[PDB]
Amino acid sequence: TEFISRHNIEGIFTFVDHRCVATVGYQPQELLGKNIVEFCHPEDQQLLRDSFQQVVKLKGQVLSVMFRFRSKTREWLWMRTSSFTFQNPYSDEIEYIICTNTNV
Amino acid sequence: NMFKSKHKLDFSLVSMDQRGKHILGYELVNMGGYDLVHYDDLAYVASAHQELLKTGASGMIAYRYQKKDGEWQWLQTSSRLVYKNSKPDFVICTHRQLMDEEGHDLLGKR
């Protein structure tokens, strides 16, 4: 039970696969354009922010962070997110960040 | 069912046949080469990109490209490096539009 999201280096959702509807209750379009931290419990945000910054810094390495995600039903859902930057095979530029978001 | 596209070495699109534009539903330039690749096919397409860069050719038997309406289009693509004054210049891709049955069958064989 998980869904994949893509983010720019700032954390903004730029793609969300439709499994998010069953996992956290939003439609993809409800997430697109918002930052991931906007769905994070206030106590967990600093850990999420620093983990996201480190994903970008450690280009290509797979990182993991746990945090509470605010579902559409306004409950705090514990989430384990595995993240990595995708590097362009030619330019080595960061195309985007891929997150696998799993309810725990 | 076949069409071509032209890309920078980093795979960003610089031109595509009008037939390919209408299949995907779109402009298509001003977009990164990986922005429409299905997340389960990213590794497959990136590995072919490396094959193209190191070797000058690559083949992708099946992968998905997101259409304008949000649906996925199964594609089968050969790619080749075009050179200029002995230096790599751009990429030319030749695509075949796959139906979902053939795409899902090829996914397990790739």
Author numbering:
A (entry chain D): 361 to 464
B (entry chain B): 269 to 294, 298 to 381
Quoted passage from the original study:
The aryl hydrocarbon receptor (AHR), a member of the basic helix–loop–helix (bHLH) Per–Arnt–Sim (PAS) family of transcription factors, plays important roles in regulating xenobiotic metabolism, cellular differentiation, stem cell maintenance, as well as immunity. From the N- to C-terminus, AHR comprises a basic helix-loop-helix (bHLH) domain for DNA binding, two tandemly arranged PAS domains (termed PAS-A and PAS-B) for dimerization, and a transcription activation domain12. The ligand binding site of AHR has been mapped to its PAS-B domain. Here, we present multiple crystal structures of the Drosophila AHR PAS-B domain, including its apo, ligand-bound, and AHR nuclear translocator (ARNT) PAS-B-bound forms.
To characterize how dAHR PAS-B binds mARNT, we determined the crystal structure of dAHR PAS-B in complex with mARNT PAS-B. The crystal asymmetric unit (ASU) contains two dAHR PAS-B and two mARNT PAS-B molecules, which form two closely related heterodimers with a rmsd of 0.34 Å over 212 aligned Cα atoms. In the heterodimer, the two PAS-B molecules are organized in a roughly parallel orientation with a total buried surface of 1160 Å2. dAHR PAS-B:mARNT dimerization is predominantly mediated by hydrophobic interactions. Three hydrophobic residues, Y305, Y310 and L313, of dAHR PAS-B interact most extensively with mARNT PAS-B. The side chains of R366, N448 and Y456 of mARNT PAS-B form hydrogen bonds (H-bonds) with dAHR PAS-B W343, D278 and D306, respectively. Interestingly, all the observed H-bonds are facilitated by carbonyl oxygens rather than the side-chain atoms of dAHR PAS-B. Of all 11 dAHR PAS-B residues participating in the interaction with mARNT, 9 are conserved in mAHR and hAHR, suggesting that the AHR-ARNT PAS-B interaction pattern may be highly conserved among these species. The superimposition of apo dAHR PAS-B on the heterodimer gave a rmsd of 0.78 Å, indicating that no significant conformational change appeared. Compared to the WT protein (380 nM), the binding strength of Y305A to mARNT was largely decreased (1800 nM), while it was only slightly decreased for Y310A (500 nM). The superimpositions of dAHR PAS-B:ARNT with HIF-2α:ARNT, NPAS1:ARNT and CLOCK:BMAL1 gave rmsd values of 1.4, 1.3 and 5.8 Å, respectively, indicating that the overall structure of the dAHR PAS-B:ARNT PAS-B complex is very similar to that of HIF-2α:ARNT and NPAS1:ARNT. The C-terminal tails of HIF-2α and NPAS1 PAS-B wrapped toward the interface, making additional contacts with ARNT PAS-B, while the C-termini of dAHR PAS-B pointed in the opposite direction.
